[PDB]
RNA sequence: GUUACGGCGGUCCAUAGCGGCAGGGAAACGCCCGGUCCCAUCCCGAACCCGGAAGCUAAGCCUGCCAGCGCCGAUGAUACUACCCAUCCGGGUGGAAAAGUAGGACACCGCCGAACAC
């Protein structure tokens, strides 16, 4: 939201702190910290700067992160689907693309409720 | 092409004023003022009959020669005060001119022809202002409406200008509109 | 003596580069950075003018000057606004502080904002005076990030002696602005 | 080609100075018995005239141009005190003791104030 | 600027970590709000503040369907 | 019926029926026109009836202009009431028509039907009037 | 019916009290006015109600000065 | 006394303005260089003020070219009009006389000073 290598993403362990990034979960955090030489049991308050630099350059060289990844997602949706594919029609109308009961419970896409 | 400057007698006005003017108009004359680069305006009494004949036979912007007490002075009809009701000429402002003056006037545009039956022609400009020498001012400036569909804004630059004449109006000036 | 980095760079090379790109008949026709203004229009202060003090603190810690609290010129029913109330903190910057802030901005803050895909070169008023805007304040290292409770963006404009967007863009890119190629 | 777009600060300064000169000159005006001591102040020099605005005529002038004051090894304020002394004594020669000070649309301070104080010392009354 | 109105300034030292790039500029971060880390730089001494990414380090423009996917998928 | 969207003053003095018209004395819009020879307040009803009379005497083909708008109110006190108790409320909308003023204009191919249509209009009108031409 | 109108203020007798050439004493009211349709000039002063009064004797002179219409008092030279 | 001139003023404050396109930097006017000092910004040495003389007439300022936009603008005529004549003609007399239009009008005057001349 402000930084890729947020100097304090949140004061807590690294394995779980790096997951405060739109392209990092628990296993990416673990494999990152393994490829580096950084413990995972250590909080972010106890960081250094060189740690942040190696993390930043590793990430920028290996995998994707907030802005570029989110743009990849939205561009995937729009462009690669199209105006009028099936998954695109259902993205457009705000409904579950992957095959789901729309009859009863598609609320995560449809919204809270519009009872008539 | 030239125009024969029509001949007229022009007695000078002795008493000038509204009483003298009205007495003259009752006598059948016309008050006029000859001015220009003469820079010493003359106040004259034309004859209404022949002056009106000249105007209706050679349009408003007419060259004319004035037997001003023997002298034959060349002039143009610059402006006319004509009454609305009577439509009698009340007064003539005349412009001294000479050979190769390139005066500026407001000449009568005239539409003619006939378009498609399914349309109508509206004249937005009674006249067009132009620059030309003061012996070849056209009596009229014609324009044609034969074979012109609706949506044909005929403007002033699209006119057939004679030789020597020069538009001083803008070509954006709409002259004729062809509509439904 | 002790001129700012950006300023000595300017009057050592950038003036000549601008002369070459635009052969100016007179040296005094050369573009130059007149001032930069940081507006921090906070229309959310009308309902409560306690956000203006945070805007003030932020702009001060950024530029180095107490801002001017811009009282509203007019009352607007829709914006919940009366006349005279504190909507906006403005800082004008000239001279050494201007050059220092520009160097800080360019070399620090713009690469510090998230997903910095450049700044638009079309963002010129038509007289070689640039203006862009930001959505937050943490991009400036001068602020303690822990003390940022509310995001508060800004509008930064760089007004120059340039007489057109082209010369303005040349000057800014020469100073080292990130103008993406579009 | 080239075409600057905004009026330069020189034009701004000139027009504004003239505005505020006329502003104070709404109240101030000179006479043969109380002339207007009008000032002009450049960054290089300073000039004063004694005006009788009834006829729009100058009675005595002084300036930091002439060598007797240009030769001073001092500041513009030193030139200003010398100009005040000169216009004071020239006014006394012209038969003047009392004037009204037109600061020319400038701020009364520094060079202008020093000139005025110097003329006040030398004998003029204001 | 006026004396008390304005915050405090002092020439401090911008240190990049990615590149070691080294700038000197006056900043509001000063003896009040500098990282408590002085060093000599030139004929004087200044406090530092550090940066993650700079104009020299940052990958921006100064220094930096799908038949192809389906063909590397299906030969 | 023509009527203005608004007037700054709804209750106005009667327009002065004197003087020959200084403007609108000519055509400037069409080929044939109605010129007035008397002073009169010409109303909405008169204008619309005359326009209609033209548009019925001749049909699709040609154009009509109305060089006067009745923006001058004329009040009317209620009936069965005494003099006084204030000025009446606006009832009629008129246009002060001095002689010379061209009121209606049209452009139509045949002079015969055009002049006859204008005659119908004049007979709808309360004044002695006249056919005029753009030419002279 | 009834009219909501019927009111009017008292006529204030504004105007020009001493025209051009009129010899006036000091303090004489020359112009009663609300604003400055007539401005003050030579030997003429403006009161709180924008009234023009002579500051000295003389004959009233109506003039102009930068578009403003002014009222001036020119002295009457004694023989 | 002469300036492509610097100030201070004036005109029924536009015949003076705006916008031209080509020019000038002698002293001066100016931008301009810096803020140590008086002083100053509801923030900013931008301004105000102060100290200065690196370069530049680019701009302001100034000079010449103008009817391109605005401004001025007669005459004559008309409208209107006091008086008069006239049994409705709002007709007409003798006086005054616009607006608009058109023809045509493009800064001037004074005082001081500066450089030069002298």
UniProtKB/TrEMBL annotation, chain E:
Keyword flag Ribosomal protein: yes
GO molecular function terms attached to this record: structural constituent of ribosome
Keywords: Ribonucleoprotein, Ribosomal protein
UniProt xrefs under Pfam families: Ribosomal_L31
InterPro entries (alphabetical): Ribosomal_bL28/bL31-like_sf, Ribosomal_bL31, Ribosomal_bL31_B, Ribosomal_bL31_sf
Protein name: 50S ribosomal protein L31
Organism: Mycolicibacterium smegmatis (strain ATCC 700084 / mc(2)155) (Mycobacterium smegmatis)
Classification via PANTHER family: 50S RIBOSOMAL PROTEIN L31, CHLOROPLASTIC (PTHR33280), LARGE RIBOSOMAL SUBUNIT PROTEIN BL31C (PTHR33280:SF1)
């Amino acid at each position: 939201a402000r930084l890729v290598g947020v100097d304090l993403p949140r004061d807590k362990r690294m394995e779980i702190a790096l997951t405060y990034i739109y392209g990092i979960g628990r296993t990416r955090s673990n494999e990152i910290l393994a490829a580096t030489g950084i413990d995972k049991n250590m909080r972010t308050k106890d960081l250094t700067d060189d740690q942040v630099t190696v993390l930043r350059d590793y990430i920028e060289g290996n995998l994707k992160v907030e802005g570029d990844l989110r743009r990849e997602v939205q561009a995937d949706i729009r462009r690669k689907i199209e105006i009028g594919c099936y998954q695109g029609l259902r993205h457009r109308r705000g409904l579950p693309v992957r095959g789901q009961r729309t009859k009863t419970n598609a609320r995560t896409r449809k919204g809270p409720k519009r009872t008539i | 092409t030239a125009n024969i400057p029509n001949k007229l007698t022009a007695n000078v006005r002795t008493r000038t004023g509204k009483g003298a003017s009205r007495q003259a108009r009752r006598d059948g004359k016309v008050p006029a003022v000859l001015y220009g680069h003469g820079t010493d305006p003359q106040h004259l009494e034309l004859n209404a009959r022949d002056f009106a004949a000249v105007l209706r036979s050679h349009g408003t912007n007419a060259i004319l020669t004035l037997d001003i007490e023997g002298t034959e002075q060349l002039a143009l009809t610059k402006a006319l005060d004509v009454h609305p009701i009577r439509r009698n000429i009340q007064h003539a402002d005349l412009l001294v001119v000479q050979r190769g003056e390139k005066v500026t006037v407001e000449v009568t545009v005239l539409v003619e022809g006939d378009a498609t039956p399914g349309t109508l022609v509206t004249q937005d400009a009674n006249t067009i202002e132009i620059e030309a020498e003061a012996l070849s001012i056209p009596e009229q400036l014609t324009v044609s409406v034969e074979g012109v569909e609706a949506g044909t804004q005929i403007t002033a630059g699209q006119i057939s200008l004679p030789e020597g004449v020069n538009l001083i109006s803008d070509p954006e000036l709409l002259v004729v509109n062809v509509v439904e | 003596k002790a001129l700012p980095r950006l300023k000595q760079r300017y009057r050592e090379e950038i003036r000549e580069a601008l002369q070459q790109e635009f052969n100016y008949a007179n040296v005094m026709q050369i573009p130059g950075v007149v001032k930069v203004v940081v507006n921090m229009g906070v229309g959310d202060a009308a309902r409560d003018a306690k956000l203006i003090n945070g805007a003030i603190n932020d702009l001060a810690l950024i530029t180095g000057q107490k801002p001017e609290v811009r009282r509203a010129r007019k009352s607007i029913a829709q914006f919940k606004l009366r006349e005279g109330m504190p909507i906006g903190a403005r800082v004008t910057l000239r001279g050494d502080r201007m050059w220092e802030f520009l160097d800080r901005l360019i070399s620090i803050a713009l690469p510090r904002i998230r997903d910095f895909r450049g700044l638009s070169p079309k963002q010129f008023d038509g007289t070689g005076n640039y203006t862009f805007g930001l959505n937050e304040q943490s991009m400036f290292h001068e602020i303690d990030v822990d003390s940022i409770d509310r995001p508060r963006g800004m509008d930064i404009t760089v007004v120059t002696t340039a007489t057109n967007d082209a010369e303005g863009r040349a000057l800014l890119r020469a100073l080292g602005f990130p103008f993406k190629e579009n | 080609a080239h075409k600057p777009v905004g009026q330069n600060i020189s034009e701004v300064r000139r027009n504004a100075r003239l505005r505020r000169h006329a502003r104070l000159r709404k109240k101030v005006a000179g006479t043969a018995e109380v002339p207007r001591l009008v000032v002009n102040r450049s960054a290089r020099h300073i000039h004063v005239q004694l005006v009788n605005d009834l006829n729009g005529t100058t009675l005595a002038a002084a300036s930091s141009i002439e060598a007797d004051v240009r030769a001073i090894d001092g500041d513009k304020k030193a030139h200003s005190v010398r100009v005040g002394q000169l216009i004071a004594e020239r006014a006394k020669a012209a038969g003047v003791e009392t004037v009204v000070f037109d600061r020319g649309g400038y701020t009364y301070g520094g060079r202008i104030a020093a000139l005025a104080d110097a003329a006040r010392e030398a004998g003029l009354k204001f | 600027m006026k004396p008390g109105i304005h915050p405090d300034y002092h020439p401090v030292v911008f240190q990049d970590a990615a590149t070691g790039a080294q700038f000197l500029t006056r900043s509001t971060a000063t003896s009040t709000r500098t990282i408590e880390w002085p060093t000599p730089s030139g004929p004087k001494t200044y406090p530092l503040i550090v940066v993650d990414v700079t104009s020299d380090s940052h990958p921006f423009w100064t220094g930096s369907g799908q038949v192809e996917k389906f063909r590397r998928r299906y030969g | 019926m023509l009527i203005p969207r608004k007037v700054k003053h709804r209750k106005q003095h009667h327009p002065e029926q004197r003087g020959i018209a200084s403007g609108g004395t000519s055509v400037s819009f069409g080929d044939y026109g109605i010129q007035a020879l008397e002073h009169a307040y010409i109303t909405n009803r008169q204008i619309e009836s005359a326009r209609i009379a033209i548009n019925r005497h001749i049909k699709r083909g040609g154009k009509v202009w109305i060089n006067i708008f009745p923006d001058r109110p004329l009040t009317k006190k209620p009936a069965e009431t005494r003099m006084g108790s204030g000025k009446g409320s606006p009832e009629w909308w008129v246009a002060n028509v001095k002689p010379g003023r061209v009121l209606f204009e049209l452009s139509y191919p045949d002079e015969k039907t055009a002049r006859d249509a204008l005659t119908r209009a004049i007979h709808k009108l309360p004044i002695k009037a006249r056919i005029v031409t753009r030419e002279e | 019916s009834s009219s909501r109108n019927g009111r009017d203020s008292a006529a204030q007798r504004l105007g020009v009290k001493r025209f051009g050439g009129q010899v006036v004493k000091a303090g004489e009211i020359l112009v009663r006015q609300r604003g400055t349709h007539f401005h003050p000039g030579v030997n003429v002063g403006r009161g709180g109600d924008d009234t023009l009064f002579a500051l000295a004797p003389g004959a009233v002179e109506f003039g102009a000065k930068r578009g403003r219409k002014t009222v001036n008092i020119v002295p009457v030279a004694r023989p």
